[PDB]
Design a protein around this ligand. Structure first.
Ligand SMILES: Nc1nc2c(ncn2[C@@H]2O[C@H](COP(=O)(O)OP(=O)(O)OP(=O)(O)O)[C@@H](O)[C@H]2O)c(=O)[nH]1
Ligand SMILES: Nc1nc2c(ncn2[C@@H]2O[C@H](COP(=O)(O)OP(=O)(O)OP(=O)(O)O)[C@@H](O)[C@H]2O)c(=O)[nH]1
Ligand SMILES: Nc1nc2c(ncn2[C@@H]2O[C@H](COP(=O)(O)OP(=O)(O)O)[C@@H](O)[C@H]2O)c(=O)[nH]1
Ligand SMILES: Nc1nc2c(ncn2[C@@H]2O[C@H](COP(=O)(O)OP(=O)(O)O)[C@@H](O)[C@H]2O)c(=O)[nH]1
Ligand SMILES: [Mg+2]
Ligand SMILES: [Mg+2]
Lengths: 107, 12, 437, 68, 431, 437, 431
């Protein structure tokens, strides 16, 4: 669940030149540094103990299937130029509504 | 097991 | 390195794919069983086929195509045809029921049945490709698989692959020739869906290619085979520079940049010259200036839309053969000095020229004569607003009485998509008139 | 009695046949042979220039007058 | 030991530079396998200006081939004189910018500049003098203009004082060959003005006119165009590469060319040039060499020098001649054409003479000129730019790849200031 | 030295053991009767068979297996089959009556008379071998002896062996199809009593292998022999590193420590790639990247579940054949950059890869194509919480109305055992949910 | 006559050391049977360093082979050059650690370290000078890490003054190769810091890119990977075996690099590296050799010395060359890349030169670096360790093999302290 970069070897190990032309999964490269010792924050079962902060995301990840994807996809325009102001408002509105639909499907 | 799923089994 | 994944959706798309893959096999010297003709010496140890045909370790050249149709036959005809050994068995995808000229069936109920499988095949082909130039989607706006499932596949491809180039070949509905009644409904809905999920959608139509076959080739019974052969020649002249040596090289990712001025104006025309028969090729000189004038003549068009009524916004000229750039510049400057051809004031530099050394390929048993030079001309006139007006008038004519709507309602779409589709096309027409003025 | 020539013969199988034609040679090779041979530039062509590959330093202690 | 690092970017770059290498190799006696089959030691004395010594008689060119898409680079490495280049000097991408300055400058082209600068740094620190870098790029394209100007900017930051010579194939007055070439040309010349110290503007219509009029040639093909351009690349380096009566390297040429830092756009020229059956009418001499140089026909730009005023002009002669004859010819040209030269600079002609001519020719001459007629080229590009920019056409393709309108406005104003500078130095009086 | 005793329990275990030992004898060159085929390797000892075979003074190779069924039908078929001389007679003990799909009957009343004999035979087979690696125990959760007697066997093996590995190959019940009706009871009970006694339980669910044979192998009606051959190939790819030379050797003790994060979660999923047939393997090459993508594809797992709806804990990739570590690294890196594959946050590094050079062995008359290379993936992921919750709901629907409880009550078992089993699987579902946060 | 004893632990150690004995038998002329068939007497002239002499012409290696299963040593024995090892030096158990550091260090490796120690003590008292020990293993396995570190601890208890070398195949940033690598590496580095004199951290991914980009080679295979590692060891050790103009043994190397006792983690590098078909374009000079050394892509670890700062650099030129070219190239690379060099150590490069290049090579060059950039590797390992130890991933194996959690906390604290001192000496200034 991490890559932590490869310094010199960023010529390879990107998805586009690894013959994966889809959208990359972004990780946290340039790993950080700690001072030493960790809190145990878990029992012998893998459970998070009482008191620790827990993510509000779904424990099964987010994968919106074909039959629960929204029937409308925005368009991936990311330009907002030479459009009318109602057109830009329409694109922003449908982007917000479809992001809300994906968040509904995830959680 | 070709006799079980031969496409011409019921023909032949 | 050059990779084009060719998706043929619909019965029209699959038949055009048959023609184009016959043409590419002939051009790269691949037999219909998918092998070099028992020799590795034609072209030497070449790998120029890599743009279309994936190659295994034994000599089998499997193509990079996905043939999709919900109905059986046609795809099963490819399965049991002469090109049976060439195509991979999972490359040809077939459903049980037919979309039955219904955008709702193609987009919501039956189209979503196979879309995960088609995307899985496209994903495997893309992972096999060593760097995609883009997708080539062949379909028709007539309705069903070529409309609803084509729009759905484009929408999901825009979800998954992001900013990947998608070049479209659409059989646009003819102005008066029609083989269905819900062609305006399907065309309006498909265009509304694929305004944002598209890059550059080349248009052809059967009526203008019929007129071309009747006038030039002198064929009194042009079937779909001849139509698909000219469409195959068009797409081959489009993709020739990725696989043949040329003086000016053009790739698949420049047709959006040099032909789409504004993000909704992405519906270019298509022309091929010289479309000629043998007895007329014996008479005609077929020089560079002659074919260059023949491209801009408003009778060689394949979209059945007179470009004198509109203004040219961009052009992409694709010369192939023993054509010289000096005469190319001379002819394309005489066209600019000509007054019949009229350009928009905001595009002085309105041409993209690409010259390839490879002469055009003559199919055996074909109808085109053997020529040494050819031009594939790719215009972006605003004359197509006439066709949009005629289509929108037909849509409103059947929509005021709300005819044929209950099929779409019962198969999974409400009146809101109809209304916003007509609104989007009216906005598109206003955009065309604004970019014209 | 089914008609013999147009009875059961599908359009794709009658049109998209396997390619076979005696004129496949002209598709990839011209029957007209090339009318020249061209060698590289030679020494008699690069040394036909009068006083070639010599400079003005070579006229010192040479004994010949400068007509160049 | 003034080394020169060569850089060919884009399709036009990878064609023209390949022709340049196969016309330099014949002058220096390098065969297609790379060995030295030379006639005199003068070819081998200064072979380190363009080549690096290898095992045996092998000499590998110091060229970097940059492209975001294989293609014409595969074609030039599969053609003749393509196996002499080192395989590590073939930095290629996989997508291609493709007539998009934004895509070539601020996108996947920018994740190749690390490898290109690694190769350039290797070939640069494998030297001892390093006169300069030269680029062979193609204003009007995606990977020629954008990526090329990015390389120019980065290498100018790394090496400020060295020469940054460029050969720019500028857009044409008639015929476009690219719809977005005003945008690409303006956005590239904005970088060129601030970065490069000398730039040679070659125009394809001018090459067509020369090949069609001086050379007839019926069917020219791009090989002859690249040969003309390559001959003028060799004409500005022949003083470094062979001894002469009056030497002038690239820095001497720059100093005697540019009067002001923002006037580094020259119009090159090579004028021993006859037709096929025209050897019997022109017995080549210095006076007709000079009038063929100063003729408007044999100028490789659409800018007519009669529609302007020659600020400065340099002439690199090669071959056997008399310095009295050369200097009297240039004085006679200047004295006959007084109004076509600026009156506040006396003797606008900088002459250099090399003893070694190109092979075959008895003697040759290379013409380069800083004139005020290049304001016509920049004004045409400004006119087309302000035609395309008022309606925001073909501009979402740049702003979606990630730039803003402020860069276009700044480039337009910079090129307008360039036009204004050329105009005010054209009509400036002595007193 | 690298010895592995295989204990096959039940009809399912005996039949998959038949297929496994056919594959083992074929790949080690053992004749079916008892010996090497005379002139084969006269000078070469070729002692790679010592993992699965022992050498006697008569020169007969004797397998290290124990076949147990409480019904003397499948064991009698083995004893009268073609491999009637391969097996030692005391290695195939059997009972007089079967459990007839009853955990209580197979564990408490008639499973107490075969346990002493099977532990005596296991003791003899362990004292015969020097350096035991672990027990490969093959059984089914469907009920009877595979759920009761196998669990009793693990309970005794925990007492008298301890730290030795106990790799289960367990037939998991299908989401839709079924043979018995009390198998939810049997599965819940056997899972409750094997959670703290096994080490790593590979799920080999039958419905997914049915659809795999229907999809990749083009078999309309697959059968138990085909599924047994696939499971035999799975276990051969698992154990091949103990017999053949390999670049990255993996033993049985690495699978537990690399696939079991917590002692409750020890149920990974096996899958194979490619499982393509010959007529389609002719069409394309099967490279390392393609077979890795085939493993990570959702419609190739041998359990009917979608791993895209869960989160991976840890994957094991056993590459087998002509594979290279750089293609392995490139494939795994491409998988990690893919978006549809998501790992759990506490496992930054989450693969265990073993490269082996021996190609897969082809059984004559089989269905799998012969390939240069293949890969067995053993993935531990949270996606099987669907299977656990569905099976638990099927248990609850029957235990709400006390259906089929009187059989278990009569055959020496208390309903407190049922209550504790249900509570234990509740805790297991809570653990599987709580891991993913 | 200074002897060193070689130990291999685990699968990686066994294969890498088998290839190492193969290459150093090839360069000394030892045939697989064990006799001598060398060309010159220099091959056997210092044969006592790595080989003990039996009766007759048999030259057994001074090697100890440890793995908890017969396994990989079975493959090595039934491979080429596997009959030279003494059968009494194969020390093995029955169980085999399942990539468990606790099993390799406390349970399974506990009742085999006595036999390994008896073998090592015998084979070391058979020596005459006993310069030191070198061990090949990985920090990602069960018996490679745990048993190897136990061996290191016991050997440092036995002989506290001898030089200790470890070759430490570290976990890779990309791919996994084992899922319990953070635990194994954190538990092994905590032992390597306080018990090893010098450590060459070697990365599979860095070796992959070295073998596949700078050598092409398509399918690289662990034979070539382990041979690159073995070539680095030979270049390290060569001053014991062959004469030179300026020799440097292991103690000179360790004194001239290691500034402070807990900073002995190095990055190796072997820098003749020619791709297939580029030797014709290769120039084969000392500046090119030094440039191929001091390139970041040529390191055998994932860490970037351009991101970090070099503390001490050792360069051994194994072959015939000039003190001019060597010393001036070291001075030039330092003075150009003075940013990637600590200012408080003036001229922080040790130079050694041998006289015998590899067979089939004119000159070779091994590179050892002690940059502060290697803290990135420990940061990666420590962060993955935190991510696992927060949720107690795979910890029940380590706790059930009789080992507590304060061992994990102490190991993590020691690694974080190591990163702290590396960053401190990176950002510390001169004055
Ligand atoms: N050029 C060309 N056009 C075709 C061909 N076949 C069909 N068309 C056009 O396609 C339009 C109808 O769309 P179809 O492709 O038949 O419909 P579909 O994609 O199969 O979807 P369904 O109707 O639901 O089966 C007609 O108006 C034709 O003009 C062909 O072979 N060549
Ligand atoms: N893959 C596979 N599964 C089998 C096979 N035979 C039986 N099964 C599975 O086993 C289940 C039936 O229960 P069994 O395992 O045969 O029961 P048993 O172990 O023989 O014990 P009893 O019920 O007392 O006879 C079915 O649901 C099948 O899924 C086989 O040959 N191959
Ligand atoms: N002189 C010359 N011009 C060329 C050559 N090839 C292309 N061009 C010019 O370059 C322009 C197209 O630029 P292009 O090569 O596509 O730019 P790129 O995409 O960045 O590589 C056209 O106007 C051509 O006139 C060549 O070989 N010689
Ligand atoms: N370079 C190289 N690395 C290896 C080789 N064999 C194993 N490795 C590495 O060693 C690590 C696994 O350690 P392993 O050998 O299993 O340790 P062990 O379990 O204690 O024997 C992996 O990260 C591999 O990259 C080899 O032959 N060459
Ligand atoms: Mg149809
Ligand atoms: Mg039974």
């Amino acid at each position: 669940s991490s890559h932590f970069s490869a310094n010199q070897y960023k010529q390879a190990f990107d998805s586009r030149r690894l013959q994966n032309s889809q959208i990359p999964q972004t990780y946290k490269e340039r790993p950080s540094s700690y001072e030493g010792f960790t809190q145990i924050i878990a029992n012998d079962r893998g459970h998070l103990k009482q008191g620790v902060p827990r993510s509000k995301d779904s424990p099964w990840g987010g994968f919106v299937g074909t039959w629960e994807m929204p029937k409308k996809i925005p368009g991936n325009v990311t330009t907002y130029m030479s459009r009318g102001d109602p057109a830009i408002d329409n694109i922003q509105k449908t982007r917000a509504e479809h992001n809300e639909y994906m968040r509904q499907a995830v959680s | 097991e070709w006799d079980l799923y031969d496409p011409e089994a019921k023909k032949k | 390195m050059r990779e084009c994944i060719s998706i043929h959706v619909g019965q029209a798309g699959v038949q055009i794919g048959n023609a184009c893959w016959e043409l590419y096999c002939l051009e790269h010297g691949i037999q219909p069983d998918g092998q070099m003709p028992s020799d590795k010496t034609i072209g030497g140890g070449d790998d120029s086929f890599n743009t279309f045909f994936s190659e295994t370790g034994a000599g089998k050249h499997v193509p990079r195509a996905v043939f999709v149709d919900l109905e059986p036959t046609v795809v099963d005809e490819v399965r049991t045809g002469t090109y049976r050994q060439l195509f991979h068995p999972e490359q040809l995808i077939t459903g049980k029921e037919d979309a039955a000229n219904n955008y709702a069936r193609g987009h919501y109920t039956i189209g979503k049945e196979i879309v995960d499988l088609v995307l899985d095949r496209i994903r495997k082909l893309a992972d096999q490709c060593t760097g995609l130039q883009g997708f080539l989607i062949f379909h028709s706006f007539g309705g069903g698989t070529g409309s609803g499932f084509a729009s759905l596949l484009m929408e999901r491809l825009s979800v998954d692959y992001g900013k990947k180039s998608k070049l479209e070949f659409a059989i646009y509905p003819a102005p008066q020739i029609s083989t269905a009644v819900v062609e305006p409904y399907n065309t309006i809905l498909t265009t509304h869906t694929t305004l944002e999920h598209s890059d550059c959608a080349f248009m052809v139509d059967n009526e203008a290619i019929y007129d071309i076959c009747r006038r030039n080739l002198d064929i009194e019974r042009p079937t779909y085979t001849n139509l698909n052969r000219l469409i195959a020649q068009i797409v081959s002249s489009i993709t020739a520079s990725l696989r043949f040596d040329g003086a000016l090289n053009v790739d698949l990712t420049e047709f959006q940049t040099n032909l789409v001025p504004y993000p909704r104006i992405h519906f270019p025309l298509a022309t091929y010259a010289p479309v000629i028969s043998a007895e007329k090729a014996y008479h005609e000189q077929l020089s560079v200036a002659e074919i260059t004038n023949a491209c801009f003549e408003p009778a060689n068009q394949m979209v059945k839309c007179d470009p004198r009524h509109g203004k040219y916004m961009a052009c992409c000229m694709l010369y192939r053969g023993d054509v010289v750039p000096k005469d190319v510049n001379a002819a394309i400057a005489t066209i600019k000095t000509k007054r019949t051809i009229q350009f928009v004031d905001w595009c002085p530099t309105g041409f993209k020229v690409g010259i390839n050394y490879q002469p055009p390929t003559v199919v055996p048993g074909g109808d085109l004569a053997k020529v040494q030079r050819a031009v594939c001309m790719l215009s972006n006139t605003t004359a197509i607003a006439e066709a949009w007006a005629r289509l929108d008038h037909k849509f409103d004519l059947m929509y005021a009485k709300r005819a044929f709507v209950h099929w779409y309602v019962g198969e999974g779409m409400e009146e809101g998509e109809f209304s916003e589709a007509r609104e989007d096309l009216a906005a598109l027409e206003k955009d065309y008139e604004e970019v014209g003025v | 009695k089914r008609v013999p020539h147009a009875g059961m013969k599908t359009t794709m199988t009658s049109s998209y046949k396997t390619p076979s034609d005696p004129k496949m040679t002209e598709l990839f090779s011209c029957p007209v042979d090339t009318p020249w041979v061209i060698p590289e530039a030679g020494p008699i062509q690069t040394f036909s220039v009068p006083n070639m590959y010599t400079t003005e330093y070579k006229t010192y202690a040479s004994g010949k007058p400068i007509t160049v | 030991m003034r080394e020169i690092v060569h850089m060919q970017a884009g399709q036009c770059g990878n064609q023209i530079g390949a022709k340049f290498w196969e016309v330099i190799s014949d002058e220096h006696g390098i065969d297609p396998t790379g060995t030295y089959h030379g006639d005199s030691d003068l070819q081998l004395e200064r072979i380190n200006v363009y080549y690096n010594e290898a095992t045996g008689g092998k000499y590998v060119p110091r060229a970097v081939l940059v492209d975001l898409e294989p293609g014409t680079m595969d074609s030039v490495r599969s053609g003749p004189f393509g196996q002499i280049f080192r395989p590590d000097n073939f930095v290629f991408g996989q997508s291609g910018a493709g007539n998009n300055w934004a895509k070539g400058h601020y996108t996947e082209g920018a994740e190749l500049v690390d490898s290109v600068l690694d190769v350039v740094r290797k070939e640069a620190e494998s030297c001892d003098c390093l006169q300069g870098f030269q680029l062979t790029h193609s204003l009007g394209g995606g990977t020629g203009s954008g990526m090329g100007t990015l390389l120019i900017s980065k290498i100018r930051e790394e090496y400020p004082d060295r020469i940054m010579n460029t050969f720019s194939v500028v857009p044409s007055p008639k015929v476009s060959d690219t719809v977005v070439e005003p945008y690409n040309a303006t956005l590239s010349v904005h970088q060129l003005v601030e970065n490069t110290d000398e730039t040679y503007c070659i125009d394809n219509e001018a090459l067509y006119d020369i090949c069609f009029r001086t050379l007839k040639l019926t069917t020219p093909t791009y090989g002859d165009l690249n040969h003309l351009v390559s001959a003028t690349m060799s004409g500005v380096t022949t003083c470094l590469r062979f001894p002469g009566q009056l030497n002038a390297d690239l820095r001497k040429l720059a100093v005697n060319m540019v009067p002001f830092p923002r006037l580094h756009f020259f119009m090159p020229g090579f004028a021993p040039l006859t037709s096929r059956g025209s050897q019997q009418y022109r017995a080549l001499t210095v006076p007709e060499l000079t009038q063929q140089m100063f003729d408007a026909k044999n100028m490789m730009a659409a800018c007519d020098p009669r529609h302007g005023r020659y600020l400065t002009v340099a002439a690199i002669f090669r071959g056997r001649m008399s310095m009295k004859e050369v200097d009297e010819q240039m004085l006679n040209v200047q004295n006959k054409n007084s109004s076509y030269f600026v009156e506040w600079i006396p003797n606008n002609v900088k002459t250099a003479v090399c003893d070694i001519p190109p092979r075959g020719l008895k003697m040759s001459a290379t013409f380069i000129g800083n004139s005020t007629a290049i304001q016509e080229l920049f004004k045409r590009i400004s006119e087309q730019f302000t035609a395309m920019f008022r309606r925001k056409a073909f501009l979402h393709w740049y702003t979606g790849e990630g730039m803003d309108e402020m860069e276009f406005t700044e480039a337009e104003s910079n090129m307008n200031d360039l036009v204004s500078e050329y105009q005010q130095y054209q009509d400036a009086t002595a007193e």
